[PDB]
Amino acid sequence: DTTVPRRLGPKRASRIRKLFNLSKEDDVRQYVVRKPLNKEGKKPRTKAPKIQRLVTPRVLQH
RNA sequence: ACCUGGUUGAUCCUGCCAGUAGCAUAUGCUUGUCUCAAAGAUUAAGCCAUGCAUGUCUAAGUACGCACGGCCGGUACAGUG
Ligand SMILES: [Mg+2]
Ligand SMILES: [Mg+2]
Ligand SMILES: [Mg+2]
């Protein structure tokens, strides 16, 4: 009758693309699953994982 | 005549005795000050309570534990862990 949510989204870029059916022209950074987090006595915040296997200028320079 | 003394009618042979200094094992009485070193052994390589004796991170493999935290709408990832 009830439901238990899945708690973690994908982290590798290709797995994000597979989950959200993205193309090559789509920006992976736009579709990162952000997690809201709010403890009593602390201001609300939102955290996202670090994308892995993401092409950046540093990799191209290497 | 290869130490000093003993075992004979004389000369000898063979068995012997006592004194003299150390090593090892065990054990006594005494022990004010100071420096250095040692520590096994029942043919038992026999039996063991308890604790300890081996762990490790740099700018540089992997952090979405608010576990703690600055800046924010630019918001993939500040940083510590
Ligand atoms: Mg990488
Ligand atoms: Mg004689
Ligand atoms: Mg290193």
From Swiss-Prot:
Subcellular localization, per the record? Cytoplasm; Nucleus, Nucleolus
A GO molecular function annotation here is:
structural constituent of ribosome
(3R)-3-hydroxyarginine occurs at 12
Kindly list the positions at which Phosphoserine occurs in this protein: 23
**Gene Ontology, cellular component aspect:** cell body; cytoplasm; cytoplasmic ribonucleoprotein granule; cytosol; cytosolic ribosome; cytosolic small ribosomal subunit; dendrite; endoplasmic reticulum
List the GO biological process terms.
cellular response to ethanol; cytoplasmic translation; glucose homeostasis; negative regulation of bicellular tight junction assembly; positive regulation of apoptotic process; positive regulation of cell population proliferation; response to insulin; ribosomal small subunit assembly
Alphabetic keyword roster: Acetylation, ADP-ribosylation, Cytoplasm, Hydroxylation, Isopeptide bond, Nucleus, Phosphoprotein, Ribonucleoprotein, Ribosomal protein, Ubl conjugation
- State the disulfide connectivity: none
Q: How is it modified after translation?
A: Ribosomal protein S6 is the major substrate of protein kinases in eukaryote ribosomes. The phosphorylation is stimulated by growth factors, tumor promoting agents, and mitogens. It is dephosphorylated at growth arrest.
According to its UniProt entry, the function of this protein is described as: Component of the 40S small ribosomal subunit. Plays an important role in controlling cell growth and proliferation through the selective translation of particular classes of mRNA. Part of the small subunit (SSU) processome, first precursor of the small eukaryotic ribosomal subunit.
Q: How does it assemble?
A: Component of the small ribosomal subunit. Part of the small subunit (SSU) processome, composed of more than 70 proteins and the RNA chaperone small nucleolar RNA (snoRNA) U3.
Q: Which family does it belong to?
A: Belongs to the eukaryotic ribosomal protein eS6 family.
The entry's protein name is Small ribosomal subunit protein eS6
User: What is the organism of origin for this protein?
Assistant: Homo sapiens
**Could you say which residues of the full protein are shown?**
126 to 187 of 249
